[PDB]
Design an enzyme around this catalytic site. Structure first.
Site, mmCIF file in Angstrom:
data_model
loop_
_atom_site.group_PDB
_atom_site.id
_atom_site.type_symbol
_atom_site.label_atom_id
_atom_site.label_comp_id
_atom_site.label_asym_id
_atom_site.label_seq_id
_atom_site.Cartn_x
_atom_site.Cartn_y
_atom_site.Cartn_z
ATOM 1 N N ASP A 197 40.603 43.142 37.318
ATOM 2 C CA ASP A 197 41.270 43.061 38.608
ATOM 3 C C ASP A 197 42.355 41.980 38.625
ATOM 4 O O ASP A 197 42.194 40.908 38.041
ATOM 5 C CB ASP A 197 40.230 42.756 39.693
ATOM 6 C CG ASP A 197 40.837 42.714 41.084
ATOM 7 O OD1 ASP A 197 41.262 43.782 41.568
ATOM 8 O OD2 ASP A 197 40.891 41.619 41.688
ATOM 9 N N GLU A 233 44.580 45.770 35.514
ATOM 10 C CA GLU A 233 45.329 46.193 36.676
ATOM 11 C C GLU A 233 46.577 45.362 36.817
ATOM 12 O O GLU A 233 46.536 44.199 37.222
ATOM 13 C CB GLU A 233 44.509 46.075 37.961
ATOM 14 C CG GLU A 233 45.199 46.708 39.175
ATOM 15 C CD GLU A 233 45.325 45.766 40.369
ATOM 16 O OE1 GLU A 233 44.845 44.620 40.302
ATOM 17 O OE2 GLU A 233 45.909 46.177 41.391
HETATM 18 C C1 LIG Z 1 46.125 44.242 46.646
HETATM 19 C C2 LIG Z 1 46.999 43.961 45.428
HETATM 20 O O1 LIG Z 1 47.950 42.928 45.779
HETATM 21 C C3 LIG Z 1 48.880 42.532 44.758
HETATM 22 O O2 LIG Z 1 49.865 43.565 44.585
HETATM 23 C C4 LIG Z 1 51.219 43.158 44.859
HETATM 24 C C5 LIG Z 1 52.124 43.648 43.700
HETATM 25 O O3 LIG Z 1 51.714 43.062 42.480
HETATM 26 C C6 LIG Z 1 53.591 43.290 43.979
HETATM 27 O O4 LIG Z 1 54.399 43.761 42.918
HETATM 28 C C7 LIG Z 1 54.043 43.927 45.312
HETATM 29 O O5 LIG Z 1 54.090 45.338 45.216
HETATM 30 O O6 LIG Z 1 53.148 43.536 46.375
HETATM 31 C C8 LIG Z 1 51.738 43.826 46.185
HETATM 32 C C9 LIG Z 1 50.967 43.330 47.432
HETATM 33 O O7 LIG Z 1 51.228 41.958 47.687
HETATM 34 C C10 LIG Z 1 48.172 42.198 43.412
HETATM 35 O O8 LIG Z 1 49.138 42.125 42.383
HETATM 36 C C11 LIG Z 1 47.086 43.238 43.022
HETATM 37 O O9 LIG Z 1 46.342 42.737 41.925
HETATM 38 C C12 LIG Z 1 46.130 43.523 44.206
HETATM 39 N N1 LIG Z 1 45.188 44.638 43.849
HETATM 40 C C13 LIG Z 1 43.775 44.398 43.328
HETATM 41 C C14 LIG Z 1 43.169 42.990 43.544
HETATM 42 C C15 LIG Z 1 42.841 42.456 44.772
HETATM 43 C C16 LIG Z 1 42.643 40.966 44.964
HETATM 44 O O10 LIG Z 1 41.339 40.468 44.756
HETATM 45 C C17 LIG Z 1 42.401 43.499 45.874
HETATM 46 O O11 LIG Z 1 42.943 43.089 47.144
HETATM 47 C C18 LIG Z 1 42.109 43.324 48.289
HETATM 48 O O12 LIG Z 1 41.257 42.180 48.527
HETATM 49 C C19 LIG Z 1 41.832 41.024 49.178
HETATM 50 C C20 LIG Z 1 40.723 39.962 49.320
HETATM 51 O O13 LIG Z 1 39.599 40.490 49.996
HETATM 52 C C21 LIG Z 1 42.425 41.434 50.557
HETATM 53 O O14 LIG Z 1 42.973 40.293 51.256
HETATM 54 C C22 LIG Z 1 42.289 40.000 52.500
HETATM 55 O O15 LIG Z 1 41.663 38.688 52.442
HETATM 56 C C23 LIG Z 1 42.561 37.548 52.398
HETATM 57 C C24 LIG Z 1 41.695 36.266 52.329
HETATM 58 O O16 LIG Z 1 42.494 35.099 52.339
HETATM 59 C C25 LIG Z 1 43.528 37.598 53.642
HETATM 60 O O17 LIG Z 1 44.448 36.512 53.602
HETATM 61 C C26 LIG Z 1 44.276 38.937 53.685
HETATM 62 O O18 LIG Z 1 45.072 38.981 54.847
HETATM 63 C C27 LIG Z 1 43.248 40.084 53.722
HETATM 64 O O19 LIG Z 1 43.887 41.353 53.762
HETATM 65 C C28 LIG Z 1 43.533 42.475 50.295
HETATM 66 O O20 LIG Z 1 44.102 42.894 51.527
HETATM 67 C C29 LIG Z 1 42.976 43.709 49.543
HETATM 68 O O21 LIG Z 1 44.062 44.534 49.146
HETATM 69 C C30 LIG Z 1 42.800 44.990 45.573
HETATM 70 O O22 LIG Z 1 41.905 45.857 46.241
HETATM 71 C C31 LIG Z 1 42.808 45.342 44.047
HETATM 72 O O23 LIG Z 1 43.254 46.667 43.873
HETATM 73 CL CL LIG Z 2 43.297 50.226 39.634
#
Ligand SMILES: C[C@H]1O[C@H](O[C@H]2[C@H](O)[C@@H](O)[C@@H](O)O[C@@H]2CO)[C@H](O)[C@@H](O)[C@@H]1N[C@H]1C=C(CO)[C@@H](O[C@H]2O[C@H](CO)[C@@H](O[C@H]3O[C@H](CO)[C@@H](O)[C@H](O)[C@H]3O)[C@H](O)[C@H]2O)[C@H](O)[C@H]1O
Ligand SMILES: [Cl-]
Ligand SMILES: *[C@@H]1O[C@H](CO)[C@@H](O)[C@H](O)[C@H]1NC(C)=O
Ligand SMILES: [Ca+2]
Length: 496
Positions: A197, A233
């Site tokens: 992740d 990822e």
């Molecule tokens: C979501 C995505 O954001 C980036 O992706 C970036 C991208 O790289 C960039 O190029 C551009 O496109 O913007 C994107 C969004 O910022 C990363 O690069 C990528 O790695 C990530 N994806 C993976 C990892 C996480 C984190 O643990 C997960 O998040 C998931 O869990 C997080 C923690 O519970 C969530 O935050 C949540 O909790 C936080 C706690 O402080 C709060 O501030 C926030 O408002 C709340 O939504 C998030 O909403 C959710 O999507 C997600 O499910 C998983 O698939």
């Molecule tokens: Cl994925």
């Protein structure tokens, strides 16, 4: 790293998003194994923060509190029980490893966790691991807010907090060891690989240092020297200092451009048409096939929480989704991951879904069991796309044609295409606003084949469309633009 470690003949994994361990164990035995699925991607099995505002959102599982195998999916015993039973039937388990961070820095200290573990985000205290202030990048991050503010600076993308999530100091051997301890525990249990992740937020070198501490797969189920399957990822759609090619040395990477582009092509957005898919794959700027993990949608972007946006296809767009998944599973590019979700109340307002946080089907927070209806569908609001005849049959189609080359391509210069895989399979698509009626070269041996999209071959017959292939390998296909499923697929095993 790069080999999935699946059983010979199985070419896909399914993401059983938020499912319970006991339900997955049963699914491995009653469906996954008999239908030829290669493995299952499970949700994070480690203890996470329990969030009641909003009520237990799906994303609370990406905010670790400890490495205890204790979540809403089940305890360590049920988890271990699931891995054992699934492996005993030839279906592997891939763990979603959340190792880049812990929970949000704003979360209130206390024991609001899935296992009662105590944690204090404010003072950086996670006694159950244990971790302290010395194990985070607070002093390493240079932004004024402490979070990631600009993705054009590859340094803060790795050293700062992703939307407030406390960032682990992965350059420290102590932290690397605590993470390896966790992953080795899982490897020794029997898991075959991991989804790393937020790999984009970690330095490729720190990931490698951690992978070096990993054991080989369990010798009770895997041949000696087996290395865990690793897919990182990394969301890279161009235009950023960070490229997914920087992570090729650690394992495969998620190719997010795949679903984004397929979605716009199938939706016929801004000029795209299916005839352009002739050189689908690397010719489109995608990563090499042997380093790619592909999919139509993911738990993230199917609800607009990831890259892809509006073009992404999901179960909500059933008809187009089935076609997209069908094309992916028929095409030889990359390693395919099938999605399996649940229904949530989509509430659009100003083009955005305010209910994108809603967690899995539950009873006062207790995840509902996956029930199977008399027609093999699921109840309790579980979509179970992997059980859809059109999808399940394409999973099998991929197994049957594994190894065969891409040949006999055809297109009407618009949205009607067709192609085969060696002499073991053929697929036809009609995405134009008019009927398709033509005789094509299939490359298949003469005989009567059952269409696996409209029906199934059941003891000597087809429950749906039947195709007749002549001596010269030619066959006639008819698909009205009004068919429920505007595409037909036949292979060596659907032959009568
Ligand atoms: C979501 C995505 O954001 C980036 O992706 C970036 C991208 O790289 C960039 O190029 C551009 O496109 O913007 C994107 C969004 O910022 C990363 O690069 C990528 O790695 C990530 N994806 C993976 C990892 C996480 C984190 O643990 C997960 O998040 C998931 O869990 C997080 C923690 O519970 C969530 O935050 C949540 O909790 C936080 C706690 O402080 C709060 O501030 C926030 O408002 C709340 O939504 C998030 O909403 C959710 O999507 C997600 O499910 C998983 O698939
Ligand atoms: Cl994925
Ligand atoms: C296929 O179905 C037909 C009836 O529709 C029956 O006559 C035939 O014997 C069946 N063949 C097999 C092999 O079961
Ligand atoms: Ca980081």
């Amino acid at each position: 790293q790069y080999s999935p470690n699946t059983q010979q003949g199985r070419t896909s994994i399914v993401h059983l998003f938020e499912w319970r361990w006991v339900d997955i164990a049963l699914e491995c035995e009653r469906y996954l194994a008999p239908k030829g699925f290669g493995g299952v991607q499970v949700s994070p099995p480690n203890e996470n923060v329990a969030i009641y505002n909003p009520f237990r959102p799906w994303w609370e599982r990406y905010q670790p509190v400890s490495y205890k195998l204790c979540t809403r999916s089940g305890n360590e015993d049920e988890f271990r029980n699931m891995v054992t039973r699934c492996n005993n039937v030839g279906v592997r388990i891939y763990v979603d490893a959340v190792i880049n961070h812990m929970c949000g820095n704003a979360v209130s200290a206390g024991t609001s966790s899935t296992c009662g573990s105590y944690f204090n985000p404010g003072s950086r205290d996670f006694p159950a691991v244990p971790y302290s202030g010395w194990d985070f990048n607070d002093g390493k991050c240079k932004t004024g807010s402490g979070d990631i503010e600009n993705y054009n600076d590859a340094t803060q993308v790795r050293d700062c907090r992703l939307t407030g999530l406390l960032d682990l100091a992965l350059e420290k051997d102590y932290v690397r060891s605590k993470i390896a301890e966790y992953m080795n525990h899982l490897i020794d249990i029997g898991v075959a690989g991991f989804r790393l992740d937020a790999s984009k937020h970690m330095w490729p070198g720190d990931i490698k240092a951690i992978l070096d501490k990993l054991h080989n797969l369990n010798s009770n189920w895997f041949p000696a020297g087996s290395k865990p399957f690793i897919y990182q990822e990394v969301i890279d759609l161009g235009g950023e200092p960070i490229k997914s090619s920087d992570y090729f040395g650690n394992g495969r990477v998620t190719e997010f451009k795949y679903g984004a582009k397929l979605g716009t092509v199938i939706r016929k957005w801004n000029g795209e048409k299916m005839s352009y898919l002739k050189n689908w794959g690397e010719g489109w700027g995608f990563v090499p096939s042997d380093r790619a993990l592909v999919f139509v949608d993911s738990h993230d972007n199917q609800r607009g929480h990831g890259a892809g946006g509006a073009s992404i296809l999901t179960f909500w767009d059933a008809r187009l989704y089935k076609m997209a998944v069908g094309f992916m599973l028929a095409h030889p590019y990359g390693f395919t991951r099938v999605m399996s979700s649940y229904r949530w109340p989509r509430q659009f307002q100003n083009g955005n879904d305010v209910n994108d946080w809603v967690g899995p089907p539950n009873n006062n927070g207790v995840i509902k069991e996956v029930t199977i209806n008399p027609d093999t569908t699921c109840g309790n609001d579980w979509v179970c796309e992997h059980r859809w005849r059109q999808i399940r049959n394409m999973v099998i189609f991929r197994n049957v044609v594994d190894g065969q080359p891409f040949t006999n391509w055809y297109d009407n210069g618009s949205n009607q295409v067709a192609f085969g895989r060696g002499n073991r399979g053929f697929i036809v698509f009609n995405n134009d606003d008019w009927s398709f009626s033509l005789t094509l070269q299939t490359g298949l041996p003469a005989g009567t084949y059952c269409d696996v999209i409209s029906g199934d071959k059941i003891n000597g017959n087809c429950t749906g469309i039947k195709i007749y292939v002549s001596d010269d390998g030619k066959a006639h296909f008819s698909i009205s633009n009004s068919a429920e499923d505007p595409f037909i697929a036949i292979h060596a095993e659907s032959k009568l």
